[PDB]
Amino acid sequence: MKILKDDAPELHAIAAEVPHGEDVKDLVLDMTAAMTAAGGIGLAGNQVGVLKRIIVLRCPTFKGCVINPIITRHTDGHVYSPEGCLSYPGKTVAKKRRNKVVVEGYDMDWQPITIAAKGLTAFCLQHEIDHLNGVTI
Ligand code: NI
Ligand code: NI
Ligand SMILES: [Zn+2]
């Protein structure tokens, strides 16, 4: 796998929902390995040229993948979140984020999962889900 250059069109494209039960274990393994090899804590399909709704995270309160992630709950208003991104080396942006979120989706074995997160972990979930919608910092 390769983390695509900052001018890759995939970064603006929409990731396709994964058909329920599709075997994506190798994809998840590859994305996880690319994320850690590059020293990151989050990665989305688009960033490695995989236009599928898959994110991987290595965050303080969640480590693993989410397939077909959706945000189902969040706190009102916003807080400041300084963020970088493996697709944009050297760039940090002060983003407005929800302080707390609930994310729902599937793990690699297609077990339904629910992730309640605050602070850094919540910011990462928002950032990575944004990627699947072609939204970048
Ligand atoms: Ni590779
Ligand atoms: Ni661009
Ligand atoms: Zn990113």
Author numbering: 1 to 137
Sentences from the paper on this structure:
To gain insight into the properties of these novel viral PDFs, we determined the X-ray crystal structure of Vp16 PDF. The crystal structure of the protein could be solved by molecular replacement using the structure of Pseudomonas aeruginosa PDF without its C-terminal extremity as a search model. Two crystal forms of Vp16 PDF grown under different crystallization conditions were used. Superimposition of all chains showed very similar structures (r.m.s.d. of all of Cα < 0.5 Å). The Vp16 PDF structure is composed of two α-helices (α1 and α2), two 310-helices (η1 and η2) and seven β-strands (β1 to β7) organized into two sub-domains between which lies the active site. Moreover, Vp16 PDF lacks the α3 helix usually found in Type 1B PDFs, as expected from sequence alignments. Unforeseen, Vp16 PDF is also devoid of the conserved η3 helix. Several metal cations could be identified in the structure. Particularly, a zinc cation was identified within the active site, which was coordinated similarly to other PDF structures, i.e., by Cys of motif II, the two His of motif III and one water molecule. Interestingly, the two final residues of Vp16 PDF, Thr136 and Ile137, lying very close to the active site, are involved in a network of interactions unseen in any PDF thus far.
Peptide deformylases (PDFs) are enzymes involved in a pervasive and essential process called N-terminal methionine excision (NME). During NME, PDFs catalyze the removal of the formyl moiety from initiator methionine, found at the beginning of all prokaryotic translation products. We provide the first evidence that some viral PDFs, including the shortest PDF identified to date, Vp16 PDF, display deformylase activity in vivo. To conclude, characterization of the phage Vp16 PDF allows us to unexpectedly uncover the crucial role of the most unusual final amino acid in fully compensating for the 30 amino acid longer C-domain to ensure full deformylase activity.
